[PDB]
């Protein structure tokens, strides 16, 4: 009955997590395996228990153990079982890390008063669920919490919420989710939130929101100095960014379905890594003065992307910064930038016909692997020193041309 001792009830493991006297807790699930249900319990609603007891001894079920509720297949093949719908008492104050992986189960109820505090990490990663009402009590989501749930199509949160921080991934590789409000609690979002999602149409903000807000569908930070998601199925063929715009963040336009124009304000100096990646509509892009910093696959997998212009003050390229634009026209390289480096250009460049650097250095660098491009591209350079520096370095024999002084 101490501390970390195993109480078995029929057929469900409880481990103690605290005792004093004839009054304890416990987690439901031994944080090892999960809970093997009967064949008559498949497909059918289940309910976990909210209290057990032992003599006179009485220990409240205040936490969902990690895998207690986990769905696994069997090396075998052989089904196994798993109710449609799963009830939470409102004992449960935490659901630990992968608490419900991969559940099968399509809903998950809240009883009345909930107590949750705390989903953590991937407690629903890659789960069946359709459906949540997330209780007002609740007030930190953990890492890709309901990440890869590709039939997920309503979360909500409870009036009153409490929810005050949601971190890295919880919404990210979602097919059916279509819009989320976020309660005016919400202090703190974690990087990448809807990675690979391809689904959401607008990212809602409650009203009253001190940290962030949502214009036309588009989350911003309150200051709007972060373009935080750009929902991928926001149907709009031009957007600009506003002018008060500093930074997109990573994934920002990630799986981007129907932008085909988009103009960038000046002020904007970062831009984050994957920010554009499969955003495959997108033909036209504005770069601004301001821009100092483009990360890693910003530009990637841009299915229509026909030229590119990188402003004249560039100081920060990411490791393969363009990768995959198959009708990408043109590139131009802006004045001042007088370094190329590593894994610059590459990938699918079928339509490349040009690339115009327009810097004068006289210690112009480029590396071996800056290009990995057709033979056939054109290169426009401003002296011989920049031609020679070029046929030193790539790969393949490119025409370079000498512009006259």
């Given at each position: 009955?101490?501390v970390?001792s195993i109480?078995?009830?029929?057929?469900?493991?409880?481990?103690?997590?605290?005792?004093?006297?004839?009054?304890?807790?416990?987690q439901?699930?031994?944080?090892v395996?999960?809970?093997?249900?009967?064949?008559?319990?498949d497909?059918?609603?289940?309910?976990?228990?909210?209290k057990?007891?032992?003599?006179?001894?009485?220990?409240?079920?205040?936490e969902?153990?990690?895998?207690?509720?986990?769905?696994?297949?069997?090396?075998?093949g052989?089904?196994?079982?798993?109710?449609?719908?799963?009830?939470?008492?409102?004992?449960?104050?935490?659901?630990?890390?992968?608490?419900?992986h991969?559940s099968?189960?399509?809903?998950?109820?809240?009883?009345?008063g909930?107590?949750?505090?705390?989903?953590?990490?991937?407690?629903?990663d890659?789960?069946?669920?359709?459906?949540?009402?997330?209780?007002a009590?609740?007030?930190y989501?953990?890492?890709?919490?309901?990440?890869?749930?590709?039939?997920l199509?309503?979360?909500?949160?409870?009036?009153?919420?409490?929810?005050?921080?949601i971190?890295?991934?919880?919404?990210?590789?979602?097919?059916?989710?279509?819009?989320?409000?976020?309660?005016?609690?919400?202090k703190?979002?974690?990087s990448?939130l809807?990675?690979?999602?391809?689904?959401?149409?607008?990212v809602?903000?409650?009203?009253?929101n001190?940290?962030?807000?949502?214009?036309?569908?588009?989350?911003?930070?309150?200051?709007?100095?972060?373009?935080?998601?750009?929902?991928?199925?926001?149907?709009?063929?031009?957007?600009?960014t506003?002018?008060?715009?500093?930074?997109?963040?990573?994934?920002?336009?990630n799986?981007?379905?129907?932008?085909?124009?988009?103009?960038?304000?000046?002020?904007l100096?970062?831009i984050?890594?994957?920010?554009?990646?499969?955003?495959?509509?997108?033909?036209?892009?504005?770069?601004?003065?301001?821009?100092?910093?483009?990360?890693?696959?910003a530009?990637?997998?841009?299915?229509?992307?026909?030229?590119?212009?990188?402003?004249?003050?560039?100081?920060?390229?990411?490791?393969?910064?363009?990768?995959?634009?198959?009708?990408l026209?043109?590139?131009?390289?802006?004045?001042?930038?007088?370094?190329?480096?590593?894994?610059?250009?590459?990938?699918?460049?079928?339509?490349?016909?040009?690339?115009?650097?327009?810097?004068?250095?006289?210690?112009?660098?480029?590396?071996?692997?800056t290009?990995?491009?057709?033979?056939?591209?054109?290169?426009?350079?401003?002296?011989?020193?920049?031609?020679?520096?070029?046929k030193?370095?790539?790969?393949?024999s490119?025409?370079?041309?000498?512009?006259?002084?």
């Amino acid at each position: 009955t101490k501390v970390g001792s195993i109480i078995q009830q029929n057929n469900i493991k409880y481990k103690v997590l605290t005792v004093e006297g004839n009054i304890g807790t416990v987690q439901v699930g031994n944080g090892v395996t999960p809970v093997e249900f009967e064949a008559g319990q498949d497909g059918k609603p289940f309910t976990i228990p909210t209290k057990i007891t032992v003599g006179d001894k009485v220990f409240t079920v205040t936490e969902v153990a990690s895998q207690a509720f986990s769905y696994y297949p069997d090396e075998t093949g052989r089904i196994v079982y798993y109710p449609s719908s799963i009830t939470i008492p409102s004992s449960i104050k935490k659901i630990q890390k992968k608490g419900f992986h991969g559940s099968k189960a399509k809903t998950i109820i809240f009883d009345k008063g909930s107590q949750l505090e705390k989903i953590e990490d991937r407690a629903f990663d890659f789960s069946e669920l359709e459906e949540i009402e997330l209780p007002a009590s609740l007030e930190y989501i953990g890492t890709s919490a309901f990440s890869f749930s590709q039939k997920l199509k309503k979360l909500t949160f409870s009036s009153s919420s409490k929810l005050e921080l949601i971190s890295h991934e919880a919404f990210a590789n979602l097919s059916n989710l279509e819009k989320l409000t976020l309660p005016k609690s919400v202090k703190t979002l974690g990087s990448n939130l809807f990675r690979l999602t391809t689904s959401l149409k607008h990212v809602d903000v409650e009203e009253g929101n001190e940290s962030f807000a949502s214009v036309d569908g588009v989350l911003f930070s309150k200051d709007k100095t972060q373009l935080i998601y750009y929902p991928s199925q926001k149907n709009d063929e031009s957007y600009k960014t506003p002018k008060e715009t500093k930074e997109l963040a990573s994934y920002s336009f990630n799986k981007n379905s129907y932008l085909k124009k988009l103009e960038l304000n000046e002020g904007l100096e970062k831009i984050g890594t994957f920010a554009f990646a499969d955003a495959i509509k997108l033909e036209e892009i504005s770069l601004p003065n301001s821009l100092e910093t483009i990360e890693r696959l910003a530009f990637y997998g841009n299915l229509e992307l026909k030229e590119l212009i990188l402003p004249d003050n560039v100081k920060n390229f990411g490791k393969h910064v363009m990768n995959g634009l198959p009708k990408l026209k043109s590139l131009t390289i802006g004045n001042n930038i007088n370094s190329l480096p590593s894994f610059f250009l590459s990938g699918v460049l079928d339509s490349l016909k040009e690339i115009h650097i327009k810097n004068k250095s006289t210690e112009f660098s480029v590396k071996k692997d800056t290009f990995a491009i057709p033979e056939t591209v054109k290169f426009y350079v401003t002296s011989e020193h920049i031609k020679d520096v070029l046929k030193s370095n790539l790969s393949t024999s490119n025409d370079i041309i000498v512009e006259k002084v």
